[PDB]
Every structure is written in structure tokens, then in C-alpha cells.
Amino acid sequence: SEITLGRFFFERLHQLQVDTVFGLPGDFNLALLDKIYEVDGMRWAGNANELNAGYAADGYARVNPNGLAALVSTFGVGELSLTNAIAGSYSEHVGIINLVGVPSLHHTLGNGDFTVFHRMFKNISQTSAFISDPNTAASEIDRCIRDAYVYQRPVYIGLPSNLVDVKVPKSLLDKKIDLSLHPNEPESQAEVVETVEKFISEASNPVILVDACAIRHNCLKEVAELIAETQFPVFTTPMGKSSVDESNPRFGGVYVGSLSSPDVKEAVESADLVLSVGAMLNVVEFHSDYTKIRQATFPGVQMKEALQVLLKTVKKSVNPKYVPAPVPATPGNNDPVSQEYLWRKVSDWFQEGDVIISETGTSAFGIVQSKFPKNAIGISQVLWGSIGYATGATCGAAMAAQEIDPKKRVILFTGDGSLQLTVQEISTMCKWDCYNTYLYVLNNDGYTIERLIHGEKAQYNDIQPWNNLQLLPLFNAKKYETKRISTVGELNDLFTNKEFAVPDRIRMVEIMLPVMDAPANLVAQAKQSA
């Protein structure tokens, strides 16, 4: 009793709750896409373009419980349009199953080299498979999907059209893909734990610092237990924001070196012990595949198991003399709305489980100062920093949220400029009735973050003004609402509006801001960049 390899692929996605598939059809993937419809619960997004599909997949993966998403593109024209999306997924460790339909000409570089596109993707892929052999095809799909999950990174699967309809035992699906990690080397683990507990013993002012890899490698429960057991002040990076429940009274804010609110700079940098969890690269750093303790590297000591074993005894290794350290902590209605006011005030509007997406620009710098609710999912592409990403990701994040909980809201802060690069993916949001979605657009008449560092008045920092609020109706939103916010009063009213808080329609809000207005932290970097 048999299934097509094509169907096998989508069945594996369904098993890992990857129930939305991003990308676009083309000459060499049509036979494969036919198979999504054979798998109960699965939908093809039908993206507005490939780059946006890739951005969507990235957004989806950051909400998907297993941290996975799937892309299907066509040979050459499809894959190369997604290049920058996969690069960013690699950069920030996002588990993308990037499948490309390839031939058994047209969409060629004029030569006869059919691997040229596969070779380009090796630099931004954890692993590849240009699948040929029918006998190993199922195993290879499984192997690639495992690597994506384990290393939390993109993988390239080239599937020739001829191998889509090749028959395979249905029984293969009865054995789940092996997602488990090898156990840590016992002696290396023991040494790490012994040494870490020893330094916690001798510390007077220890702090916990959580970065993004703590999220990717599923250590958020472990991190919460570590805060519980030690009662140490805890902080995140901007890339790691939402790793820690910011409701926790021990949470001290977001560490950004010299760009931190001075209280954060002092609390972190005055510490005699830093317990770093999942840094992206007297200090302890737990990483995915090793542990650093000062200038010593312990190769192979994986962070999840190490933390789990640490938590069994960590409380009783705390200095007996240690006291839980204290942690860091009004305009007119018709005053124009400011960056400073907006990022403070949005804290009051967020709710448990909000997906909160911030584009590179004033938005990403601003949201740092904002306070997230319990079980917030933060998305900010701080490392790769490709503008446009946030709008594509919002599409994927919204479709993932739809599959988890209809009550779960997905909130975007994009600039006017970044919106332009990836605007057509709002189409896809409207196609799938993403009534969970809030598109906040900051209109400051161009590229304000760039104006601050270089070329304040230069024409390259200009953008064509758009009637942005006409976008949702142009893309035929079935049920939608639009608002323009110019004042503190309008913003306050919007954030206490009971109807607006309910995710029952797709919304866009345009917030009018001065050309050169910026959050305090970005004003600081601008001044020291000079």
C-alpha cells in the first residue's frame, strides 16, 4: 500500500504541524503541488512573489511550535528570487525546508550546467540533497528535514519532476522523523555543571542574559526555571527579546551594550558573573553545541540537557549571602504623536500571546524600549537586517497564528519605506482572511534611520508617498478597518477602543511622525556614529 514521494513530502510537513507551504508554482513543480491537496489540513499560500514567500516562511517558522516552515519554488527563476530570504534564515538560524522543483533550454544561463543554482545555495544552506536515486529519496527528505530542525537553519532539496510520482511505502510515515539530539558526553557535562555551580557559589551580583539561540533550541522553559530557582536579575538581547516573560518581576530589560538605558548598562556590566544562554557570537555561555566558561571552550556540551541538569541543583549552589538584586524600572491630547510616546504607550495595548514584529528602522530600535506581555513572540531581523522582511514575515506569522488559536493577534511595526519593498504580500493576508493581523505603518516621509546616520536631506532617502490605507481595499480585504493617528489623543483612544483590540478583521493603522523623530536609543547611536 503506497504513496507518491510528492505526497510523502507533504505528509512529513503535516506530521511536524507545517500545515502552510509558501512559494510559487513554475514549470518544474506543478506535479508536486498537486499533492498538497491530497493531505488533509494542508494549504498552499500562493504567495505574491518568491522573496516574500521566503520572508513568510521565516515568519511562519518563528511561530511554528517545532520552529519549521516549507518553501516550494521552480528551477532558476523561482529559487534565485528567494536567495536573500534563505540567507537571512541562515543568518538568524531559522529552520526553512527550502524545496526546489528541478528538471528530469529555458530558465538556463545559456550553458548546460543544471547544478549552478544548487551550488549558489550551499553557502546559505546547512545541508543539500540534489535527489536522484529513488531508493534513498524518502531517507534524504527525512535527513534534510532533521538537519533544519536540529541546527535550526535552511536546507536545500532539489526534487526532479520525474521523481515526484515515484511510489514509496505508506508504512514509512508510521516511523516519525528522528528529531532527538545525541546525549551530551557525560564527563564534559559533569565538568561544565560542577564549574558553573562553583562560580555561582562565589558570585555576589550575578545576572542572566538570554539571546535568540535560547528560542531556536527550545530552552525557554529551562530559562524560566533558571530565573525561578536563582532569583537572579534576567535581561535579553534585542534579537532575543520575548525569550523572557517581561511580566517577571526579575526581568531588568534589554541589554544593547552602550545603546542600553543607563540603568541596564550598569546592572549588566557591574555583574561579577554573567550566565549567558544562547549568545549568537567572568562569563558562562551556553551555546547549541558547546559551553564557554571564561576562556575555556567545552566542545559538544549541548545547551538544553546541560541547563536541565543544572536546574536540579542550581538553587542550592546560590551564594547563601546573596539577596535578590533590585532591577531597572505626559503629553496633551492634541500634541503630535512622537516615537518616544508611541513605544512607551504600546506596552499598555499588548496582550498575552501577541506576535509582535518590528522592521529594521525606527520600529526595531523603538520596540526594544516597549514592554511585551506574557507569552509574546518577538520577531526583529536584527542580525541580517533586510528591510521588507517584516511585511512578508507578518503573512507567515499570521497564517501560523490561525493554526494555533483564532484569538492570537499578529502585530507589525513597519516603516513607510520598508513596506514598499514587500507590499504585495498583504494580498496573501487578504486571500486567507488574516483577521488576526494589525499593520502599523510609521509614515515619516522616507528612510528616517538612514537620514540620522548619513544624507539627512539626500534624495536617495526619499520615497514616493503612497496612499497606504488604500492598500487593504485594493487587495480586496473581505472585512477590514483603517485609521490614521496624528495625535497622542487619537493613539490613546485607539488603544482603549474595545472593538479594535478584537482580531475580527485585518487592520492597517498609519501613524504620522516627524521626518527626523527617533527613539532615544537610535538618537544615541546616531550621535556616536558621528
Added chain:
Amino acid sequence: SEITLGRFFFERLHQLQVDTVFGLPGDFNLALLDKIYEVDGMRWAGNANELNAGYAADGYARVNPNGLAALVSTFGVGELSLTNAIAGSYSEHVGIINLVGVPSSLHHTLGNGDFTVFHRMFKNISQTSAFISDPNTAASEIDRCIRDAYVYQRPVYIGLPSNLVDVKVPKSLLDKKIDLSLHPNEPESQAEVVETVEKFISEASNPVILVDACAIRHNCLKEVAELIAETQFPVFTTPMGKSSVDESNPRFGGVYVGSLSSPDVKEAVESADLVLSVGAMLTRNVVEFHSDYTKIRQATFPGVQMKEALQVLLKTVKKSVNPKYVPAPVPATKAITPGNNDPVSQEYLWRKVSDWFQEGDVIISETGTSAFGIVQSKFPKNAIGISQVLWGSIGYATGATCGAAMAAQEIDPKKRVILFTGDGSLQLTVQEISTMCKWDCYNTYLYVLNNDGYTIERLIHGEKAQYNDIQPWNNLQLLPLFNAKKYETKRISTVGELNDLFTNKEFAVPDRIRMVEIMLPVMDAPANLVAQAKQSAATN
């Protein structure tokens, strides 16, 4: 008296009449972009995204008299977004000067410390590269890369570190123009080619000329016209070469597409005892002039470049024609007249637009029904045809229209730039209409064929499959949403409306940016695409 290397770069573009520069600013190109403004006549497009910038550059290059365009992007996030644009430019031989601003010689990195990773990826879709380091050779390298782009009519990758932008250089360097000229052909090889070709023209009863796109890229259109004049042989183009030959020429027999040709064309070409092919991109009595070499039957003559070869052939080719040869009759356009109130069709549209075109029209057709349709349409004298037949990346046409329109603005305000894009393809690159509105591209006509999704795909596989659906857009709202200063929109549903649109005297004048939505049945297609669809099912 000295200039920055940054300014030098833009001065060289000005000298090659590349007066528009496409792409977007980023962390590692701001100091460089400052220099565009120091070079009188030059403008920064400020594109809506990098892929579209790349598509625009491609469109610009296909109108620019030297066949060149310039891109500026930022390290990582900028360049990788343009990858598919540069691949297509490489595929179809378009001369893109793809410059990328890079860090000084840990943000927009793959997390490692490998700063060449993006340069190495672009080598596969670049004729040549320069990751410029040395101040002493920097000017020379820019020059070398720009020459290769022109000579090989292909993209070139220039990585310019931020620190080298403001490095001073003699102004006098600009007094030595970049050498664009080709080495003369080896005289003996050329003589052998010409002697052999003239010998086979002597012995031929029914010879034909077939012109492909490389005849355009390597500036042989005058030579091709003289060859038609001198031989009076029937001449045809490929779809990729359409507009290489003036379709007004009475010796022009139409567009050869193998089995997908109107049967008259199939017979006229395939009955020939001699094919004089000019600039093929790649019966048995065949001569192919290529950029690099000449093929005569089973023999390759390496190094015999096509322009000079043709020029030397034209001096004596007329006197090698059989004296008894009678100019062969050419395919006549075979009549199809529906009623005013009949719904508009693909067949009617592609016949009827022939009557609306005018001397010098830039006519751009997207992959889909449009590209297949425009083949059957008749172009005017000095038409510039743009159809990405080889690479075939949907979205391209809308980006290219932006670049084609800005190039047209620099040549002649009266020169119209006309786009046929599908409803589906439009979605992929829609935001570049913004750039058209920003620069008052009042030369631009955006024809959108609304057939409720991906019709060319529906024809080959998955007629009713959900992947061939697209979200319906209120497409005609696009120009006002992007704040077109002066614009006009029309929806065409009927033969009557289309006829009226094409005799409308105001609409013909390029004094405003226009979009026309043409409503067509889901499965309507031009005859030639209906043919390929049916035999693509035979090959499956």
C-alpha cells in the same frame, strides 16, 4: 585637479550615456550615492525594491544606445535581492554594471567572518568581477569591468569598499575614454568565412535570413538591413529577436518559432535550401554568424566576430546572388472582424494592436499569454521589442518597463513605452509602478490582461488547481495609490471598447501615465500558445 573614485565611477556612466542609476541605498553605499548628484544630468531612480531595480536596469540597457545600465546595491541584503535579475541579464546577454557597496578593506553577515561569500555566488552570473582593494588600480578595474559588460553584453560585479569611495584620483583620467572597440578579426579566417558563405549563396535556389537577439546586442541591425537590401532574400526573426528587423520591410516574412509558427512561416523557413542565421543564441545548409565565431555547416571558425564579418560580406554579397534568382514571395498576414459588443479575445487583441503602434514604440511583453500573443502582432519601424523568452521570469516586464521608460525620457519625450503584463505577473513586481509615478513617466502604457489567474499554466497543467489562482486586485487603483500626478485608466471588455481606445486621439499622446485592464476569458490564449499547450501534453 582631483575627483573621488566614487565620482569617477558615475562620470564613466555619464560618458556612456548611462544617466539613470537603479538600486537602493544601504549601510555600505551612502558615501558612494552622494557622488551621483556631483555629475550633471544623472539621477538616482530610488527603486521600490532591489529585484525590481535589477529588472529596471535590464529594461534600461535594452533601450540605452550602448546597451548598458548601472545598479548600486548594499552588501548582502541588497545584492542577494537582485540575484534573479542579474541571472536573467546574463542569460539573455544584457550589459549590467552591477556595483555593490561592501565593508571597509558583523551586521548583514551569515554569522561567520567570510566577506567574499556574496561575491563568489555572483561569479556564476557575472562575465567578470572586481573585489577592489588596491587604490592604485581601482580606476583601471572599474574601466576593465565596464568594457567587458559592453563587449560581451553581460553583467559584471564590482565590489567597492566604503573606504575607497572618497580616495582622490586625477580628473585627467576621464580624458582617456574607456576603449569599447573590438580587436580586428583574423584576416585569413574572415576571408575563408566570406568566400565559403558567398559560394553557398551562389548555389542556393531558396535562401532565407534568420535574425536572433545577439544581432541586437552586438549592433548589427544596420548590417542586417543592408543584407536584406543587397540579397532581396526573405528575412525572419526569432521571438527573442523580434524588432531586430523592421517589420515594414516588404521582404520580412514574420517570426519563426519552429512548430509554433503560423503554418506559412513554418513552410517558408523550413523549405529553404540555405539559412543565413545572424546572432542565434543556441535542413543542414546553415550559416550562423555569432559574436565570437562563425559556423558554416559542421565547421566552426573560432574568433570571426559577426559585425566586421557582415560589413566585409556586404561589399560583395550582392554579386554572389544567383543572377537567375527571383525574390521569393513572403507569408502575407492571413485575415481573422467580430461585432462591437462581442467580448474581447486574445486573437483579436494581438491582430488589432498592430494598427495602434507608432514609429519608435518600446513594446514590452511579459512571459504568459502576452509574450506568446505579441509574436503575432506587427511592430512599427524602429520598434524596440522586450520579451524575456530565454530566462522567462514573470514580474520582469513591470520592472523593465520602469527602466525602459526612464531611458525613453532621455532619448525623446514623444517615444512611448508600452507594457503587456498578465494579472498574475503584475503582482510579483507591482511596486515599481511607484518609481514610474515618482519620475512622471508620462510615456508609459501599462496594459494588464485580467484572465483571473495564471492562464499559461492552466493550459499545460492544473486548469482548475488552486495554485493557478491569484488574489483579485482592483488593479486600476494602483496609479492613484502611488500618487500619479497626471494619469488615466480604462477597462476594456469588448471589441467596440478596444477599437474606440485605439482610435482615441488623446490616449495616443504620451502626456500622462496610463493603465488599461483588458478582461479576457480564463482559458483564452493565442493560437501559437494553444499549439504548444496541446503538444506539451503529448510530451507528458
